[PDB]
Structure 1
Amino acid sequence: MENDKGQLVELYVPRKCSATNRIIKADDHASVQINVAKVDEEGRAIPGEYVTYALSGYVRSRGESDDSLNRLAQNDGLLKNVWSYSR
């Protein structure tokens, strides 16, 4: 958020969970940030080119991190037949 005349205030716009869209706090030490390598046309992983997911400590502690990562990965197309919407 910002004041009356442009000029963004609120230092540290925080990250949000890729699964539950909740704010990942500064002291949330059970939260992770997965980086998956991109692959180009030969089977080789390009260094420095990742697709990135952030998972909150709540979902990791509840044990939905694996299923949530399955869904996010299949949505981004790097999984094929792992996750089903109709459970």
Structure 2
Amino acid sequence: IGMFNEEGENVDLYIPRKCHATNTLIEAHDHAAVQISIANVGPNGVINGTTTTLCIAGYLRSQGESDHAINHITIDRGIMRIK
């Protein structure tokens, strides 16, 4: 997922996270840059084994589309219900 050497050796220093809204890389120096981990649920309403986590870039929180963007993602993920 990074630039590979002709010999196949992965050359990257690290592979940054990408905003799940804007698809922008999250930079080391970006201090909004949130993860939001929603606990995944199963019947009877108990938490088990929840991997679904959102990444939002510093840009987007400061305009206040973080909320609008997390509605869009949780709906594509099915964590939410349109009605």
Q: Note whether the superposition's TM-score is higher than 0.5.
A: yes
State the Cα deviation string for residues 10-58 of structure 1 (Å, max 9, x = none).
Answer: 1101111100011100010111001000111110112x52311100010
CA distance in 2, matches of 1:49, 1:80: 19
- The alignment's TM-score, normalised by the length of structure 2, stands at 0.91
Alignment partner, residue 41 of structure 1: 43
Which one of 15, 23, 45 corresponds to residue 21 of structure 1?
Answer: 23
Q: CA RMSD in A?
A: 1.2
SS in 2 for 1:53: strand
Equivalences, count: 81
Question: Could you tell me which amino acid in structure 1 is paired with residue 42 of structure 2?
Answer: D
Distance in structure 1 (CA, Å) of the matches to 2:51 and 2:15: 22
3-state SS of paired residue (1:37): coil
> Structure 1 residue 81: deviation in Å?
1.6
Per the alignment, in what secondary structure is the counterpart of residue 79 of structure 1? coil
Of Structure 1 and Structure 2, which has the larger fraction of its residues in strand?
A: 1
Equivalent in the alignment of 2:59:
58
TM-score (normalizing by structure 1):
0.87
Percentage identity across aligned positions?
44
Gaps of 5+ in 1: 83-87
